[PDB]
UniProtKB/Swiss-Prot annotation:
Zn(2+) binds at H65, H245, D247. The lineage of its organism: Eukaryota, Metazoa, Chordata, Craniata, Vertebrata. Keywords: Calcium, Cleavage on pair of basic residues, Copper, Disease variant, Disulfide bond, Glycation, Glycoprotein, Lipid-binding, Metal-binding, Methylation, Phosphoprotein, Repeat, Secreted, Signal, Zinc. Changing R112G: In Yanomama-2. The modification N6-methyllysine is found at K532. It comes from Homo sapiens (Human). One of its GO terms (molecular function) is exogenous protein binding. It comes from the Eukaryota. InterPro entries: ALB/AFP/VDB, Serum_albumin-like, Serum_albumin/AFP/Afamin, Serum_albumin_CS, Serum_albumin_N. (4Z,15Z)-bilirubin IXalpha binds at K238. Ca(2+) 1 binds at E4, E242, D247, E250. Residues 1-184, 185-377, 378-571 form the Albumin domain. Belongs to the ALB/AFP/VDB family. This is Albumin. Glycated in diabetic patients. Phosphorylated by FAM20C in the extracellular medium.
Length: 578
């Protein structure tokens, strides 16, 4: 294209472009003020408008990277503030940008963004929505460099959707909070998800990713033929590589390409994309990414024909082990959108293992005749965990369910820090709440997604804060071994009950009117340490100690009750629990 910025501006919109450029600059110039970026945006935007006005206007012809880099090198505070990031400015573009990528900082070290009071927000919103949206856009972008700009934008507009919606409702907070919390969550899952997706590719391997991808793709596009799914995973793996590589523009293009490829091939891919393809370049790939599984073809055959019965299972497998395995995965996944990808991978890894084993032996067919029976222990297992957990959760609610989880895991991994156990437990509960509402069919996918994110947040938090080798194990496990390993975490019977400490167990009227979250967190962190000091305590002895608390607390909110009515709880339980 003549002038890529003219182009971009025109095929994005003034708005989207201002937002993206902001996000873009916010993401490198993470220690720069809002107004400086706004200045740059304005400086970039207006310039772009000249490039639009006339695609031949000086500097319009320049690469979106060059402009961007130049624009980055126009920031005066650039050497003082970004130090060596500024040295990038001396490098010629190909290197200049790759140098700016290097100097993007994932854990950039910023104040936690503190959700202001609704009214404050709702008013700042109403007054200067544009500034509102961008100022926070700014904060989230610089906090999340690497976080894919357009998506951030989509959260942005969803944030706008939540403010426009809630800032004119009877109870603003009753409306917004849940919504900002939804967005807060999904913003984190999405950030956590990207974090992961890039780590995934590197540690677990391009293979593992392609496998994961094929399974996903095939569940999402059952009626797509394997050659098609594979095309998509080859390209998806590429776009993915580039988005991880971090460069927004390349990445964005790659995803645009793919999305266009996928829209000019909806018939070959999915019938559920009509919606996703009528959308603008911007929303395309992301809509696509999020698209739901297409209906699988009416009455498909077992995989027994191609993977057991076929004469040439072994020949086909050996002639291209990974294509075949992908075909298995394809055929298995397409048939099972109900399975979590990793499951499919476990099944495929399994069918790979026996093929490896069998195809060598005198009679493979005999040997691998019952390979699918090996698939049941693997399918049911995580299927059971859904039934079981969604049962547990339906008999307990999000909250007491987290508490269920908390004691389960604190018992499983007592060394893990308590805030961690509280969060992963809390998030776990949340994913329980989220995926259990889902029907049996969509449950496992759903879980796996949140799960791998929860697990990964847990796992990387556990990295260089390590406390349980068994976790480091479950963390340094295979993409597919990860969750099982965890689900294989027993109670740490070598665990020495952490020595008692009254302070963690003394609470105050603080508790009675803390936000219902803080309440839960303090209760759950309490419940945790409770298990940490008394690992060996039956669901009998705990519903005991907890039903105490519950009573002990509402039968208190003259608040020195906590120092005394507390004292009793502290010693009563201590003795009761052996
Ligand atoms: C590349 N990665 C990690 C992926 C992100 C989101 C969805 C993905 C799906 S899917 O079945 O859930 N979605 C349908 C195909 C998505 C094609 C649209 C491109 C969006 C992916 C961009 C995100 C990225 O490449 O990291 C299958 C395979 C990979 C996906
Ligand atoms: C030779 N090359 C480069 C290849 C050609 C064609 C397909 C290929 C696939 S694939 O995604 O299309 N096929 C699915 C991969 C099979 C993986 C099944 C086992 C699960 C992971 C293995 C064990 C582990 O590391 O967790 C993956 C990797 C390489 C492929
Ligand atoms: C500096 C001006 C250009 C800013 C554009 C960078 C972000 C690219 C937006 C195009 C969106 C790609 C499609 C997608 O979301 O997958
Ligand atoms: C406590 C977990 C969330 C509540 C119910 C769903 C989670 C259990 C499902 C485990 C399977 C997820 C990944 C996998 O396929 O192994
Ligand atoms: C503290 C470890 C969290 C362990 C949860 C790992 C598996 C949760 C998925 C469902 C497992 C039960
Ligand atoms: C060792 C004796 C001190 C008592 C330990 C208090 C920890 C109990 C946490 C409360 C769990 C939630 C119960 C509820 O839903 O109210």
């Amino acid at each position: 294209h003549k002038s890529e910025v003219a182009h971009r501006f025109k095929d994005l919109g003034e708005e989207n472009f201002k937002a993206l450029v902001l996000i873009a600059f916010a993401q490198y110039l993470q220690q720069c003020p809002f107004e400086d970026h706004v200045k740059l945006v304005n400086e970039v935007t207006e310039f772009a408008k000249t490039c639009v006005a006339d695609e031949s206007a000086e500097n319009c012809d320049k690469s979106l990277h060059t402009l961007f880099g130049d624009k980055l090198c126009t920031v005066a505070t650039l050497r003082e503030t970004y130090g060596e990031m500024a040295d990038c400015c001396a490098k010629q573009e190909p290197e200049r940008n790759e140098c700016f990528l290097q100097h993007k900082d994932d854990n950039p070290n910023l104040p936690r963004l503190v959700r202001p009071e609704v009214d404050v927000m709702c008013t700042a919103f109403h007054d200067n929505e544009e500034t509102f949206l961008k100022k926070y856009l700014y904060e989230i972008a610089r906090r999340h460099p690497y976080f894919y700009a357009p998506e951030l934008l989509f959260f942005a507009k969803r944030y706008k959707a939540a403010f426009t919606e809630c800032c004119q409702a009877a109870d603003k907070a009753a409306c917004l909070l849940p919504k900002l919390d939804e967005l807060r969550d999904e913003g984190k899952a999405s950030s956590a998800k990207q974090r992961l997706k890039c780590a995934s590719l590197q540690k677990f391997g391009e293979r593992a990713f392609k496998a994961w991808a094929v399974a996903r793709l095939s569940q999402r596009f059952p009626k797509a033929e394997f050659a098609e799914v594979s095309k998509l995973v080859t390209d998806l793996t590429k776009v993915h590589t580039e988005c991880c590589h971090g460069d927004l523009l390349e990445c964005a293009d790659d995803r645009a390409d793919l999305a266009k490829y996928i829209c000019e091939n909806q018939d070959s891919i999915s019938s559920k994309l009509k919606e996703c393809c009528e959308k603008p370049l911007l929303e395309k790939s992301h809509c696509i990414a999020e698209v739901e599984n297409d209906e699988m073809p009416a009455d498909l055959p077992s995989l027994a024909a191609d993977f057991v019965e076929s004469k040439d299972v072994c020949k086909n497998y050996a002639e291209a082990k990974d294509v075949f395995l992908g075909m298995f995965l394809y055929e298995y996944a397409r048939r099972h959108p109900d399975y979590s990808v990793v499951l499919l991978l476990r099944l495929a890894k399994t069918y790979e293992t026996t093929l490896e084993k069998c195809c060598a032996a005198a009679d493979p067919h005999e040997c691998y005749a019952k390979v699918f029976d090996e698939f049941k222990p693997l399918v049911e297992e995580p299927q059971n965990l859904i039934k079981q957990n969604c049962e547990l959760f339906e008999q307990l609610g999000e909250y007491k369910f987290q508490n269920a989880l908390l004691v389960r895991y604190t018992k499983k991994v007592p060394q893990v820090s308590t805030p961690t156990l509280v969060e992963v437990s809390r998030n776990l509960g949340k994913v329980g709440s989220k995926c259990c509402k889902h029907p049996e069919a969509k449950r496992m996918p759903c879980a796996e997604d949140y799960l791998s994110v929860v697990l990964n947040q847990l796992c990387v938090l556990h990295e260089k804060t390590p406390v349980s080798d068994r976790v480091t194990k479950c963390c340094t496990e295979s993409l597919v071994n990860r969750r099982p390993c965890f689900s294989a975490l027993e109670v740490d019977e070598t665990y020495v009950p952490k020595e008692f400490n009254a302070e963690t167990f003394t609470f105050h009227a603080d508790i009675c009117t803390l936000s219902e979250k803080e309440r839960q967190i303090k209760k759950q962190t309490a419940l945790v340490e409770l298990v940490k000091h008394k690992p060996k305590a039956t669901k009998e002895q705990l519903k005991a100690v907890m039903d105490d608390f519950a009573a002990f607390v509402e039968k208190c909110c003259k608040e020195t009750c906590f120092a005394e009515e507390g004292k009793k709880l502290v010693a009563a339980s201590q003795a009761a629990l052996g």
